[PDB]
Ligand binder design. Sequence first.
Ligand code: NA
Ligand code: NA
Ligand SMILES: [Zn+2]
Length: 327
Amino acid sequence: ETLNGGITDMLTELANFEKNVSQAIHKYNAYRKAASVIAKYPHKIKSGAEAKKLPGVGTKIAEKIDEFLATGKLRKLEKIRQDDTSSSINFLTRVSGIGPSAARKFVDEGIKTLEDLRKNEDKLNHHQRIGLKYFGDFEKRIPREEMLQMQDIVLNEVKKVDSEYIATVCGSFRRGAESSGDMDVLLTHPSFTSESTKQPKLLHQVVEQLQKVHFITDTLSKGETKFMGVCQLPSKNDEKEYPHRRIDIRLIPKDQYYCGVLYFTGSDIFNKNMRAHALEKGFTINEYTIRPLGVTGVAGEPLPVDSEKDIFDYIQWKYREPKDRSE
DNA sequence: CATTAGA
DNA sequence: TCTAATG
Ligand code: NA
Ligand code: NA
Ligand SMILES: [Zn+2]
């Protein structure tokens, strides 16, 4: 957590690179396990040799570890850090839409900068178009104060279209967080579940709503179960307009909510831990359900959920307010 | 890890 | 169809 820190971060830096700038999937996977195991080791790595003892630890990285151990750096790390092309890829990346593959592509084409990207908006797809267009605002955080504002409106039309709707704004937001990165709206309806062969319109209806009123302003991607967009709060009585913000709404079979809700609510650790517990408590948790374990090794049969509570009750735990779902 | 775009 | 990108 700190005794092995530098090792892990240099390693990851090492890892990441192969992955993006190079197409070294394996090298990259390599760096990661090591960077993983080296992380668990309860003692100060004092040397390669030491490190090497480990699993996934080979000559290659051990070699790396000494250099870093001995001198507070790493050339290879210093060189890449320096490398304009590679720099370039990591940069181009931030563009919503832009991935390693494209990054590389644009780089080879000569598009290394923001501006380069403008000059060639043609070379970009809608997604990137937008991404481009709202790069600043996409990078900005979302003050909960806004989260509230936004949530308020969202719940309003949801209600407005059909009163039979159930929306929940999941994630860190849900968890109290001072700020958030994008709003997540989990959605469902009784008239939709596991079997009831859809009603794409279900999702459609609402998105359309939000737009009709100007909450939604761009569509990154609109599917029959997962809308992915952009939104903005009516810029008041002037002098202050709201930054463009990322939004995701998703349809869910009413029969799958709570778990999903539970789940999307995190925290990553709260989850993992609760989940770990369900196992002992003879169960299985996952993004859509909760199944009872059968000694044979495994088992099925999705227990019925009507609330965050049912899951809780199930694994005989203390209802945790989302507030304290931190871990 | 599953959903969407796109070509 | 596959491949990329988001989460
Ligand atoms: Na080893
Ligand atoms: Na990106
Ligand atoms: Zn999101």
